[PDB]
Amino acid sequence: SMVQRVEIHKLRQGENLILGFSIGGGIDQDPSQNPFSEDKTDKGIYVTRVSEGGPAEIAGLQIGDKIMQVNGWDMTMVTHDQARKRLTKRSEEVVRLLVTRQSSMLSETEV
Ligand SMILES: [Cl-]
Ligand SMILES: [Zn+2]
Ligand SMILES: [Zn+2]
Secondary structure: OEEEEEEEEOEEEOOEEEOOEEEEEOOOOOHHHOOOOOOOOOOOEEEEEEOOOOHHHHHOOOOOOEEEEEOOEEOOOOOHHHHHHHHOOOOOOEEEEEEEEOOOOOOOOOO
8 A cells, every 4th residue: 555645625505615525434434344455353433535636646545545634633443523623623724644555656757
């Protein structure tokens, strides 16, 4: 798996600002119910949906991505609602994420 930096600018949907994805997981949840994890004891926060055409998709977020950090806050052992809260601060227009993603990128040049 690889680490990836993702930056998402929220889109104003009337009065709300939204990122355009859904989360699952958290240390309060039963990790057996998470289909995206490789290890079914992983209680981490996973991207379970990405809204087509939305800010997260355009920013490069992918379904199954594990969210490790949001704006400098570590997300590996947070509750589901703690994750929600960190992602939905009305004050914050931009969310910067570190995610892990399970995986020829070699640039080759003729001379
Ligand atoms: Cl919750
Ligand atoms: Zn698309
Ligand atoms: Zn910006």
